[PDB]
Amino acid sequence: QLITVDEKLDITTITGVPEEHIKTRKARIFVPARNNMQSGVNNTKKWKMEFDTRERWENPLMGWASTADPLSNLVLTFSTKEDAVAFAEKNGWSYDVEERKVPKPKSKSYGANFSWNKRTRVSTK
């Protein structure tokens, strides 16, 4: 019916990635920062995974940005931290997790702009 396998899950040997990219690349797990130029926070939800950077040299003929690493443009989206960690564990890439940094909400109050004895009051609008 159903066997009981009691080993750490690992599929490093079947995915087909050359080992050069398995034990060497240092995947990165993080909640993407907010692009400071905008106040929209719809892209700070899903945990993205990515690898480390590698050199991009210049094609002599046209000065383009050539590259050798095939995983440079690789990005994956995971719903929570654990779902991402497992996918790295069962492939061999040494991962590094970074804690979500939730903006500490502030106590905004319009009525403070006009204070009798508080320095918060503004001299203009």
Partner 1 sequence: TYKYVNLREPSMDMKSVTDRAAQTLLWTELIRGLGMTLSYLFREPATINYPFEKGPLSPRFRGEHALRRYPSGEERCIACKLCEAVCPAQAITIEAEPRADGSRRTTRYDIDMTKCIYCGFCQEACPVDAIVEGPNFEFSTETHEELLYNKEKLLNNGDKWEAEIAANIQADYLYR
Partner 2 sequence: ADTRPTVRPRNDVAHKQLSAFGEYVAEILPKYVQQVQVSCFNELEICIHPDGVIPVLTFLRDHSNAQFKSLADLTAVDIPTRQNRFEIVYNLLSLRFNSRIRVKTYTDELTPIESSVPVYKAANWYEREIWDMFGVFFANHPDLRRILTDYGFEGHPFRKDFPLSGYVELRYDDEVKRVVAEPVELAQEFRKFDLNSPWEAFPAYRQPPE
Partner 3 sequence: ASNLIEVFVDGQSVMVEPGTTVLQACEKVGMQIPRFCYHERLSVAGNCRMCLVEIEKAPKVVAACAMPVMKGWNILTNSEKTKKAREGVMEFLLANHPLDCPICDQGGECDLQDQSMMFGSDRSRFLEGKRAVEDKNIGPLVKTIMTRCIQCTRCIRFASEIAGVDDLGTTGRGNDMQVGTYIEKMFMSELSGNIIDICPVGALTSKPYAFTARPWETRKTESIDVMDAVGSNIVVSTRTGEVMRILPRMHEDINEEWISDKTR
d(CA 23, CA 84): 18
Q: How far is the CB of 64 from partner 1 (least distance, A)?
A: 7
Q: Check the CA dihedral 8-79-18-58 and report its sign.
A: negative
Binding string, residues 70-99; x marks residues near partner 3 by CB under 8 A:
------------------------------
Residue with tokens 């804690």: 99
Residue from 5, 60, 104, 118 binding partner 3 (CB under 8 A): 104
Residue type for 58, please? E
Burial of 69 (0-12, 13-18, 19+ CB in 10 A): middle
Residues in contact with partner 2 by CB under 8 A are: 11, 14-18, 34-35, 38-43, 45, 56, 59, 61-62, 64-68, 70-80, 83-84, 86-87, 91
**Stretch of 9-17, 18-26, 31-39, 85-93 lying at the interface with partner 3 (CB under 8 A):** 31-39
Asked whether position 107 contacts partner 3 by CB under 8 A, the answer is yes
**Among 3, 9, 14, 37, interactor with partner 3 by CB under 8 A:** 37
Class of residue 55 by CB neighbours under 10 A (exposed 0-12, middle 13-18, buried 19+): exposed
